[PDB]
Amino acid sequence: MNIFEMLRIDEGLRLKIYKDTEGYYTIGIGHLLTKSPSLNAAKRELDKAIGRNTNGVITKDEAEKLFNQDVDAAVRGILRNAKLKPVYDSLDAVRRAALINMVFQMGETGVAGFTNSLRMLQQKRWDEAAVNLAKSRWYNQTPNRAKRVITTFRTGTWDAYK
Ligand SMILES: [Cl-]
Ligand SMILES: [Cl-]
Numbered sequence: 001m002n003i004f005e006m007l008r009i010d011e012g013l014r015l016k017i018y019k020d021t022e023g024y025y026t027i028g029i030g031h032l033l034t035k036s037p038s039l040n041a042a043k044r045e046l047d048k049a050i051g052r053n054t055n056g057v058i059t060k061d062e063a064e065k066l067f068n069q070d071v072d073a074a075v076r077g078i079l080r081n082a083k084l085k086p087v088y089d090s091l092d093a094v095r096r097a098a099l100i101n102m103v104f105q106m107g108e109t110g111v112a113g114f115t116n117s118l119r120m121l122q123q124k125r126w127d128e129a130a131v132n133l134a135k136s137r138w139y140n141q142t143p144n145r146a147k148r149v150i151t152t153f154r155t156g157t158w159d160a161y162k
Contacts, residue, residue: 001158003071003097007104009161010145013063017042017056021142027056028063030104031070074103083112090122098152105145106138121153130154 011030017039020026025033025042033045043056050062078084078099088099099121102111112118114136120129130150133139139146148160 001161003100004067006097006101006158006161007067007071010101010105010148013060015058015060015063017046027058027066029067029070031063031066070104071100074100077108078103081108081112083115083118084108087118087122090124092156094156094158095121095153098149101149101152110138126154126156 008029013029014027017025017027017033020030020032024035025039025045027033027046031049033042033049036042043054046054046056046058049066050058078088084099084103088096091099099111102114114133117129117132120132130153133150133153134146136146139150151160152158
């Protein structure tokens with residue numbers, strides 16, 4: 001199992017504009033298009049992202065191309081962030097994937113907002129960090145996905161995804 005397969009399980013794949021759990025216009029593998037209510041503002045972002053007139057529909061390849069870009073951006077954003085980088089450097093390969101997942105879903109700013117849990121992860125206090133991560137809007141809004149991510153932090157294995 002790897003970051004790509006893990007995110008593909010959490011986000012799914014959709015070839016037509018859809019609304020995410022928060023109600024925002026999305027497409028592909030969790031690719032956020034816009035927070036605007038306008039389905040047209042969304043089709044516009046979409047064409048701009050793909051470099052063609054899509055009329056809200058893309059192919060598998062296009063979805064995969066956006067997905068590669070997004071994972072790359074997540075990793076690069078972590079490495080460029082003064083609060084995230086030290087955490088990432090401290091972790092093993094599995095737990096590194098769990099942090100990339102959180103960043104992909106909620107952005108760098110969101111994650112950097114989990115100051116206390118991040119400090120616990122750095123100190124390798126696994127059980128304490130899993131408990132603190134659960135006291136969040138994130139866990140309350142997307143409980144099944146949060147549980148999988150949290151178990152990955154607690155155990156350092158891919159168990160929740162197998
Ligand atoms: Cl883009
Ligand atoms: Cl969920």
